[model samples]
Target chain A: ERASLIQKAKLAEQAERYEDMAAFMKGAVEKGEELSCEERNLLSVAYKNVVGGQRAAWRVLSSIEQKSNEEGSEEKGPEVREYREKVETELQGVCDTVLGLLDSHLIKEAGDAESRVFYLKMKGDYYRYLAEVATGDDKKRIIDSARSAYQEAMDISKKEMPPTNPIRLGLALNFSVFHYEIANSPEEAISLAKTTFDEAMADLHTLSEDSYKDSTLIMQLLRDNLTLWT
Target chain B: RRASAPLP
Candidate 1:
């Protein structure tokens, strides 16, 4: 049973009314002390939205780590070192959480090689979109994360016993496209693009034999990946 | 993975 202010605050936040959202969220955080776990969870989310997701996550993580150290025998002597370590620990947790979320949301559906390939293509598309939006360090981070996910997908396919699905091969092709786009050198992009093309062809060859032709979609994805470089 | 509530 949220107060009218809290409910309206959420709607304001959804509409990007930052000032109103912040006021309401602050009130909830201050006045909603006796909230249930469910309500607390809701308030936590609302508070985070009012602040910022990344900022709130780091803040909560740091507070927990700091409390743990304070309860321990370690007296906080060096504030600088303590703050630095706390930030490092919090960031590690954030990355782990992000990767786990991506796995569950994107890669966990790989019940078979075919479905795995579809997942890869979709995952690659996500990374591609990220690359478009990210800048500087953020851009590099997204590319690295996407590459790591693709590698894991490939490693899984390595053990896949035949009747080898074209889907896995297609996924590998999509992954190569990512590498191609983000390559450090022009030759590198061209080389990776060539490899991706080869993989796409292999998928076609196999798909033809299996009477499960999806080469059109695969080719279209390949074209899109290549188009990014051009 | 630490069990947590779903994302809002």
Candidate 2:
């Protein structure tokens, strides 16, 4: 069953049918199957494609909702208002499902240091995504979860992994983002990204030959965020 | 909300 699921998952990925891949992988993971790190990576991509657009839509709606609720703002039409609620419900469901999977299945069952850091980073990321559109007490609690996961990953990744490794770089890049955007600490964000970038650059040549493209590309994102922020 | 980061 696992092998068949993997085959379909990979085939769906090859065809760019990410939803199908997500279904296949998610079904397997929920059924207590174990995945290789690469399969988990595929699962990550599949869900991102599934959830990312919805997350973006929620952010747009959040901005609109804020303006609508202001003292003097024009009334948002019933049609638009209902659609906003619909999207919010949908977004929250998917986020809850994935977070449930990450907490009970992926992160808890991670087999090694690399896998642990990867899922912890993922845990932080989804919580942040949820926080972006959440409100009041829910938002505060969601951000707390995000901060915990990011802090845990940062401590483990900094000590145990190579600075040039993509997972390590990715964790640093995202944790810095959490600080700047949600945590409201621009100084700490800038400091973290700059330190990571410089450390990676010093060992750029020694980066694993196989992941050169992915590793280098993410480093570029780290630098890009730094440039935009500072 | 940044979906473009590479993680795994």
Candidate 3:
């Protein structure tokens, strides 16, 4: 009965309707129910798919505003800022909700190694999203929070899971992207991705039957980003 | 920048 809502989330996921998935999961969470890590993943990933484009759109709008300022005659500047303000609030609310969930509950209930890294990396991901819209004191706070959360997830994944583990590889991939996108450390991101990929390559043959598919899937992402970044 | 694979 309580889980029917989460079941609806699963149906939404299978239907590739991530916004609906997020809505359903949010409904469950707002009812003051506890979530298993898998259910929390459902919530996190659903919201991420729903809002990820808006985050990227914010970046494009920022660059557009910069060019408008330099051009000095365009009416687009005010219009762009006006639209971005709306997006900023919309984007801000998602991070506020999920980070609140992470701080107040989900992170505390991450009872296993993989779930711990998954949720912790998720913390980094949302805070990094916050950094996309933030300025001044709030900017500094979220960026620092994002960095620490990413590093904490990285440390735990490396210690608790094999290099060929999907969650671990995914953590490495996201953390590398975090450095490049959020920290402006492209070189550091390259090295981190490179080392992780190389380590996983060496251990490739040792991968478990169950892990091979997902691990390889994430490794290709690491390799792809490496090629793209470098 | 080209988007890499989407994050999980």
| Candidate achieving the largest DockQ | 2
Docking class of 1: incorrect
lDDT of 2 by residue, A108-214 (tens): 87787888888898889888878877879888899899999988988888888888878888888888888898888989988988998889888878646676776
In model 1 chain A, the worst 10-residue window by lDDT is: A32-41
lDDT of 2 by residue, B1-8 (tens): 23236635
DockQ values for all predictions?
A: 0.05, 0.40, 0.37
Please, what is the TM-score per model? 0.40, 0.89, 0.87
- Number of the candidate with higher lDDT, 1 or 3: 3
In angstroms, the error of model 2 at A194 is: 0.6
Off by over 4 Å in 2: A60-76, B1-4
| Off by more than 4 A, model 1 | A1-101, A105-110, A113-117, A161-166, A199-212, A216-230, B1-8
Ranking by TM-score: 2, 3, 1
Quick one: best lDDT, which candidate?
2
Candidate 3 lDDT over residue span A1-230, tens digit each:
55888999999999999888887887787666567757877887788887786787877887888888889846876898898788788889978877887777667766787877878887888898888778898888888999898888888888888888777777778778888987899999999999998888898887677767777888888988888887
